[PDB]
Amino acid sequence: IGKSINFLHQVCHDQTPASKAMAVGKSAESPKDAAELFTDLENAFQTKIDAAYFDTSKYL
Amino acid sequence: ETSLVRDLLYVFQGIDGKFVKMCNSENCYKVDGKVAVSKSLKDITSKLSELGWLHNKIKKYTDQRSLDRAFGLVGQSFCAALHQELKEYYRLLSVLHSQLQVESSLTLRRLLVWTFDPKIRLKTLAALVDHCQGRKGGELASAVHAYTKTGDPYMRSLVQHILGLVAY
Amino acid sequence: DKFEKETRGSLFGALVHSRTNDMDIKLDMPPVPENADLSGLAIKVPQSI
Amino acid sequence: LPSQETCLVEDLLYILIGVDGRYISVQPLVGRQSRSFSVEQNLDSSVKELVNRILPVATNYSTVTRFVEENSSFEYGQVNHALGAAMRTLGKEYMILISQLEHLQRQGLLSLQKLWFYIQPTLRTMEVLASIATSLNKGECFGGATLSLLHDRTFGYTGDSQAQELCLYLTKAASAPYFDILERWIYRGIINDPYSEFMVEEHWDQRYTIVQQQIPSFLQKVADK
Amino acid sequence: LPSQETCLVEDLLYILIGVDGRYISVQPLVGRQSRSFSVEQNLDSSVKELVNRILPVATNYSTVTRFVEENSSFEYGQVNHALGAAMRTLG
């Protein structure tokens, strides 16, 4: 997924794949991990990387 | 007796007190040349011995980092954990002085046991650091997770807070 | 935050009497029960609900 | 001479929590189960027998605590480490009536016969935990076979209310790990523990290695399921 | 023994704003950039825990002194004089 973002830098864009709803996500995540007891997510973390994966592969 | 009650506050607060133990290693055993005292004081000194030693183990790692920008990452998020469970080691130390100075006021078997639940909490934290002296990332993240595989949810939670913050 | 408040309150688990953020509370175990003098005692057993 | 009679009362309470005396000497033995305690003899023949009568009651606790608080801590993390840590948790609450008993002292107001009558229900309570500590050390049971002894024990004993209450409680907090890895295996299909606790041990139509030495605690029909 | 104990509490409160104590001697090394403190010969043996209050106020003055030196004399309005005002608000 980190290789693919570099291939659109060979197309040169500063765009986070397709929608800007991927951008809202970075802002949402940083409070959601911070507010928690001291616990990090990790069974849900692999779920939205699918929704990132299908987005940046069909778009590339 | 009661002098030793003000003395047992000081290796918890730092290291040494009234009568010096002469070592920041090994086990932090009473040295005072008093043996014509009763041998049950001696058995409470050997409990205290691994309380004060387990406290000086937490100081070594966060003071060996002596905050550096080199591995400013993940190494120092683990030290911030070590600072948050130190602060609490001092917080039961303060309700123990509030019992001392009253405006029983002397220890009993109550606090003799009370101390050991922090020992087994701080032991969970000794076991996380003996495994990995390294400051390198993803090596500490493989270190604290090998203690979350174990049985018993009681220490598992304690290592979840560290694994959540190593991960942060 | 839940872990910190719980820990801070229970004074690192050294209070099994109630949780309070007080550093000046005297640590006292409850006096011997009513019927102890009749029945002796046995170990206390706690629950989960 | 009457003071030596209260002094032997106060000395016993440190034997009781399993540490070294003040005039009662402790023998070294390794793998000990009952280490001999040499009492300070007393001048009147009746007060010394009383301290010999309470003496196995303090011994049998002190030994069964000493090795389960450490043996559990050596373990790989199976359900029996969760059991063995739960005995140490239960040993916390033991220490509350003993710490409250000395709270009533600041002069003699106790006798040896009051000490034993206070712990008389609790001596049946510790010795039914002694028989769990004894079997699990004879077999050196792995995590499937602990729970297999332990099930039948809290459902083949009755003899005290507060005793059956605990041996249910702590086996149910050791079964709760086991039940959770059942739910990970019967819903998701993963199997992950440090050391396997089941009969199944993954890798024609062979995909499993099966044994009858770590089967569930319940009758073999659910193990087939 | 408690009388010396409340004393070293009191005397610490005066030290802590990076100011002269009573039985605690402060000497500036190089122009107030570093200042070494000298705690009294204590009649209790909490001496090690006394020094664990020295190192907090040790790192106190060398913030305060540096920035009251920056913003008043160096005359860089951009950042240096501005940030000196900020850290003074945290003072």
UniProtKB/Swiss-Prot annotation, chain A:
It is found in: Cytoplasm, Cytoskeleton, Microtubule organizing center, Centrosome. Necessary for the recruitment of gamma-tubulin to the centrosome and for the formation of a functional centrosome. Belongs to the TUBGCP family. Interacts with gamma-tubulin. This is Gamma-tubulin complex component 3 homolog. It comes from Xenopus laevis. The lineage of its organism: Eukaryota, Metazoa, Chordata, Craniata, Vertebrata. The chain holds residues 485 to 544 of 906 of the full protein.
